[PDB]
Design a protein around this ligand. Structure first.
Ligand SMILES: N=C(N)c1ccc(/N=N\Nc2ccc(C(=N)N)cc2)cc1
Lengths: 186, 186
């Protein structure tokens, strides 16, 4: 709990003021903890942030798990998951601190390491969809892992580098993509 | 040179660090110049940055012109463009910085105007490729502009969120993408 309290307050601090501006000092006092406790649990702000990202990652899976029920077939799960990724991030408060964190620790392979363990989790989503899709003759892919890293990053790029147009156009495009992509698998 | 020497340093700081990560003070102190210098050419930081992007963009589209000749069909031009994006030292290595600048300056329409004019060069390459492919009868695209934006963004995605993996593993994925994508266009 004192650990959970820290992660909760930290999450809010990062949202209201960003990664860089937020100090462990603030986190320490606001969660009524201590530098020692914070160190014992996370060692560094970087690690603390990675753990928040971890928790967020879990919630996203939990969400997806109950959200994918609206998609009977994997084809649909592909469509839905990509659309969800696009819409939910449009209003994800932590997104900014993440940008800040990423573009701040992508030079050090230290933190860059644990981040892939994290990204892998986001790719599993696809992995499952593509594997499951195979065992249902929805398509036939022999290099799942591959196609999965692709869908993951292709989708993230569409979500990340299309910031300017109205939300409908985006969803329209993202869907066009899921269509094209799922078609090139046949 | 002077102006051109600034652009050179800034370009490095924007990559080696980030948009926000680097300030007008750094660029100056690390160029033997002084504060009250940048004006007629570099009035503001957002101006200096947008300038760098303009450069890198044109240096890349040019390299592509002097390299796409090795691709007889447009099908091959697509693969080729996507592969090179992984190896070039232009534009793409500044995507991280762009992301920040785009999510922290997409309000003042004074930017989104010029900022988006730069987004047309980005998707143009695919525009030409996809459009020409229609004439060359290699495929049948109706919503070229959409596909171009989609391909462009999808690719930037595979390029940006994999910069920490075996450079050849990347080429591999990217090629699998190009394959998957084009096969979907028909
Ligand atoms: N195949 C991967 N390594 C991979 C998989 C999933 C993934 N997901 N998101 N990545 C990601 C990367 C950067 C940002 C950002 N700060 N703009 C946001 C998200 C990123 C990378």
């Amino acid at each position: 709990n004192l650990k959970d309290k820290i992660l909760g307050v930290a999450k809010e601090l990062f949202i209201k003021n960003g990664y860089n501006a937020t100090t462990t000092g603030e986190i320490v006092k606001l969660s009524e903890s201590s530098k020692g406790n914070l160190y014992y649990h996370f060692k560094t702000k970087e690690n603390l942030f990675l753990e928040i990202l971890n928790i967020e990652e879990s919630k996203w899976q939990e969400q997806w798990k109950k959200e994918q029920i609206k998609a009977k077939t994997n084809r649909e799960k592909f469509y839905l998951y990509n659309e969800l990724s696009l819409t939910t991030e449009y209003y994800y408060p932590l997104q900014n601190a993440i940008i800040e964190f990423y573009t701040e620790y992508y030079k050090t392979n230290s933190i860059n390491e644990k981040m892939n363990k994290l990204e892998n989790k986001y790719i599993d989503a696809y992995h499952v969809i593509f594997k499951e899709g195979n065992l249902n003759g929805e398509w036939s892919i022999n290099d799942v892992n591959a196609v999965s890293k692709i869908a993951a990053n292709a989708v993230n790029g569409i979500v990340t580098f299309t910031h300017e147009q109205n939300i409908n156009e985006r969803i329209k495009l993202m869907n066009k993509f899921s269509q094209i992509f799922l078609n090139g698998l046949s």
